[PDB]
Amino acid sequence: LEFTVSANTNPATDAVRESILANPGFGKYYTDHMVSIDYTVDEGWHNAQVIPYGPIQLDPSAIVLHYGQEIFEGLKAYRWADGSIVSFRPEANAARLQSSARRLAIPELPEEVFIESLRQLIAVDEKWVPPAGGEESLYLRPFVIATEPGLGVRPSNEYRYLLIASPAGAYFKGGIKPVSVWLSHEYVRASPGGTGAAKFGGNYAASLLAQAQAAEMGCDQVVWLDAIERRYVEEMGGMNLFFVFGSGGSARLVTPELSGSLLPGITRDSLLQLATDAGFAVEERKIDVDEWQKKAGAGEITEVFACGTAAVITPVSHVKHHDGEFTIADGQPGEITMALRDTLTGIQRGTFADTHGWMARLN
Amino acid sequence: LEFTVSANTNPATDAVRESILANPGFGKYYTDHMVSIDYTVDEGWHNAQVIPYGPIQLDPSAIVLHYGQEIFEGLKAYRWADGSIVSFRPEANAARLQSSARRLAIPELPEEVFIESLRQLIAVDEKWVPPAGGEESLYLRPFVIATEPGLGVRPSNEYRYLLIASPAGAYFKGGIKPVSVWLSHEYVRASPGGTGAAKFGGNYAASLLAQAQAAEMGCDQVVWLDAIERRYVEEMGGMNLFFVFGSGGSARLVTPELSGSLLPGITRDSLLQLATDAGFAVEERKIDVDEWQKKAGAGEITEVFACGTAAVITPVSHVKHHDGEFTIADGQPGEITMALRDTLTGIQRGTFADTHGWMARLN
Numbered sequence: 001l002e003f004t005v006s007a008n009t010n011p012a013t014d015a016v017r018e019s020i021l022a023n024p025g026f027g028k029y030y031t032d033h034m035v036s037i038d039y040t041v042d043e044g045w046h047n048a049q050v051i052p053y054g055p056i057q058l059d060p061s062a063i064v065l066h067y068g069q070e071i072f073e074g075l076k077a078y079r080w081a082d083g084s085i086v087s088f089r090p091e092a093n094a095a096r097l098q099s100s101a102r103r104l105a106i107p108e109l110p111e112e113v114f115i116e117s118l119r120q121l122i123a124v125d126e127k128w129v130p131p132a133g134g135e136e137s138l139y140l141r142p143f144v145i146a147t148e149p150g151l152g153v154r155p156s157n158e159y160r161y162l163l164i165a166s167p168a169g170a171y172f173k174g175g176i177k178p179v180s181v182w183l184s185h186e187y188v189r190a191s192p193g194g195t196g197a198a199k200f201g202g203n204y205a206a207s208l209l210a211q212a213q214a215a216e217m218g219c220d221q222v223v224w225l226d227a228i229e230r231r232y233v234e235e236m237g238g239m240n241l242f243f244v245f246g247s248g249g250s251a252r253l254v255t256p257e258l259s260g261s262l263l264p265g266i267t268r269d270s271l272l273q274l275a276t277d278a279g280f281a282v283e284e285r286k287i288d289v290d291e292w293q294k295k296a297g298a299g300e301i302t303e304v305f306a307c308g309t310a311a312v313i314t315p316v317s318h319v320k321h322h323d324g325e326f327t328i329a330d331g332q333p334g335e336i337t338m339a340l341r342d343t344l345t346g347i348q349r350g351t352f353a354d355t356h357g358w359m360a361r362l363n
Numbered sequence: 364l365e366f367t368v369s370a371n372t373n374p375a376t377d378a379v380r381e382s383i384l385a386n387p388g389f390g391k392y393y394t395d396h397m398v399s400i401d402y403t404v405d406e407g408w409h410n411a412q413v414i415p416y417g418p419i420q421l422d423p424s425a426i427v428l429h430y431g432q433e434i435f436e437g438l439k440a441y442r443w444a445d446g447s448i449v450s451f452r453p454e455a456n457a458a459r460l461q462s463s464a465r466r467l468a469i470p471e472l473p474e475e476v477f478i479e480s481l482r483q484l485i486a487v488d489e490k491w492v493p494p495a496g497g498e499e500s501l502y503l504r505p506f507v508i509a510t511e512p513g514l515g516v517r518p519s520n521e522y523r524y525l526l527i528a529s530p531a532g533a534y535f536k537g538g539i540k541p542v543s544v545w546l547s548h549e550y551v552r553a554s555p556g557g558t559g560a561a562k563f564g565g566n567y568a569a570s571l572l573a574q575a576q577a578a579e580m581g582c583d584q585v586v587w588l589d590a591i592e593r594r595y596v597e598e599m600g601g602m603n604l605f606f607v608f609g610s611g612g613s614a615r616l617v618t619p620e621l622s623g624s625l626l627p628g629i630t631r632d633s634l635l636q637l638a639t640d641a642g643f644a645v646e647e648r649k650i651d652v653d654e655w656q657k658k659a660g661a662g663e664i665t666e667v668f669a670c671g672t673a674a675v676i677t678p679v680s681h682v683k684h685h686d687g688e689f690t691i692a693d694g695q696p697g698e699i700t701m702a703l704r705d706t707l708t709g710i711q712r713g714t715f716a717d718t719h720g721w722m723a724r725l726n
């Protein structure tokens with residue numbers, strides 16, 4: 001697929017850009033350009049191009065505005081010491097976007113086109129990638145929306161793929177700070193036969209009240225329990241969870257299994273591998289509130305943390321739920337939690353060896 | 364709220380508008396204008412206006428395009444013999460949009476403003492309302508979308524309410540026709556506590572695969588079973604269901620109760636009342652597949668029909684599911700099914716007495 005480039009004539013000044021890169025926050029500012037690719041049944045994906053970041057046009061009856069047919073992804077681009085610009089496992093995101101697409105009846109975007117859109121945007125907006133050897137990065141947000149007009153309920157026949165970038169600092173206010181969680185007694189993030197395994201906007205809109213309630217109960221984030229038995233721990237907001245049993249090199253990690261409604265996080269998959277590389281025993285099984293509170297209080301469960309592209313790893317220190325409340329260890333980020341975070345971020349920044357070939361060059 | 368009007372300087376010629384009204388189909392064509400109301404935290408709902416139907420603009424990071432925070436409604440405008448333009452229970456739609464808004468963390472729109480937008484649009488696009496004495500109408504689609512830019516996950520602080528209209532000709536052009544249904548064994552429409560009771564786009568995008576599967580099994584529409592026991596019948600696509608036991612004046616009606624996950628259909632609410640007015644005994648309870656097939660085969664269940672705004676009432680004649688297949692009576696639309704459809708549409712068209720005061724003037 002051939003991309004055409006229409007340069008932004010009035011991009012952010014070097015001063016404004018530098019200012020942003022110094023204090024970017026998350027998903028607040030956007031680069032000067034974006035990638036756009038159209039889709040029609042007859043031409044498939046076409047009219048791929050790099051254009052200036054700006055307002056999009058949609059018919060009032062566009063399917064995405066009524067029946068929420070949309071999906072998204074989230075990955076990062078990093079600037080290395082040698083001046084190269086790389087991304088962490090972009091092939092995985094390409095593949096998951098196709099998985100989310102299938103579950104939502106949206107045409108798949110070829111992985112080579114996905115990866116190419118990334119290279120094209122960085123080619124024009126490389127100066128928006130943060131300096132090497134830092135916590136900052138450039139968040140890439142690939143997404144697809146149904147654009148065909150018509151109020152009839154059915155899969156759209158026209159779509160638009162968009163790629164925008166946003167300098168990223170720290171998703172959670174604090175970063176090196178553990179969060180408290182409220183286990184939702186009233187809400188579920190998904191159920192068997194649902195869209196829990198797809199990175200689909202609908203999933204997030206549905207969770208807003210549950211998060212609001214977590215905050216009203218005096219907690220930072222909501223944690224999801226299975227929709228069937230209302231007993232098994234799944235995720236924290238839109239992040240996977242890990243439980244650390246014991247400590248030192250003999251410690252073991254437990255994380256909820258991919259039941260079918262759980263979203264297969266790439267950070268999760270990576271951490272399981274890194275844990276094994278380190279020598280820790282890992283296990284993907286079901287774990288319920290009862291065992292959690294019991295072993296945490298007992299001291300067997302020494303740490304708990306959430307993981308995801310945006311925050312990478314976030315320590316969990318306190319738990320509150322319909323039938324109890326307890327703290328994890330001393331309420332501070334655990335040894336293992338931080339050891340794994342330093343290793344993962346180290347690989348992403350080019351500091352540590354990438355033995356699994358996870359880093360790919362974008363430039 | 365005061366509405367400002369910006370007339371369409373390029374409206375559809377009389378030739379085009381007339382050709383559309385002669386064969387409008389459904390949700391295919393739109394009138395010359397649309398209503399728009401903006402929402403910000405400091406100004407609340409404001410800048411209410413009637414403007415030309417046309418493409419709207421959104422920032423690429425608009426929340427609705429990433430985390431599906433949106434909701435909608437569906438009602439109709441009818442032209443009566445006396446020349447008036449009326450609507451069926453529009454106050455109920457206003458109330459439901461508020462209910463959907465609350466579940467999706469979206470600011471509620473005052474019922475007074477909702478009704479006003481309806482009056483305002485009809486004021487300029489009255490010519491698009493079909494002739495009286497027929498079964499055609501003007502479908503009204505009110506909806507709210509989150510427009511604030513920002514990739515962080517949280518309720519939007521900026522919204523836009525839009526009201527568009529689409530002519531809708533006779534649903535059943537050549538005589539009413541019954542549909543076949545596939546009871547979904549693999550998918551669920553919603554889970555307890557979820558967003559099943561809200562008119563939210565996400566619910567529909569998630570159902571696309573299940574409908575495609577129903578068709579692949581050789582059926583017209585997909586029917587939903589409860590997410591818990593996977594045995595209790597809920598709805599057909601985006602329409603409620605009714606079961607007719609027996610026949611004649613002593614017939615009895617049974618419909619799934621509002622378990623909390625079912626969508627409180629307005630057509631459904633109306634039919635339960637009309638059934639009572641005719642002297643039919645009614646029941647709002649759970650009914651499983653076993654009872655359905657068993658009693659349908661024994662001839663106790665004589666009819667089944669689905670209901671909703673667009674089609675009003677659609678007969679269901681054939682059922683197929685994981686463990687069986689059966690037909691309802693003679694496979695034709697039942698007596699009670701058509702009697703009730705004739706009564707309801709008669710009230711909407713102004714032919715029968717509106718004893719409950721459901722019809723409201725829009726003009």
Ligand SMILES: *Cc1c(COP(=O)(O)O)cnc(C)c1O
Nearest residue numbers: 238239240263265266267308309
């Ligand atoms: C995106 C997402 C994650 C994390 O996936 P990463 O690939 O690690 O970024 C976890 N859970 C849900 C529900 C998600 O949508």
Ligand SMILES: *Cc1c(COP(=O)(O)O)cnc(C)c1O
Nearest residue numbers: 601602603626628629630671672
């Ligand atoms: C809109 C809708 C209905 C029908 O409601 P009416 O008010 O009768 O138009 C039924 N089920 C679902 C899931 C819906 O979204």
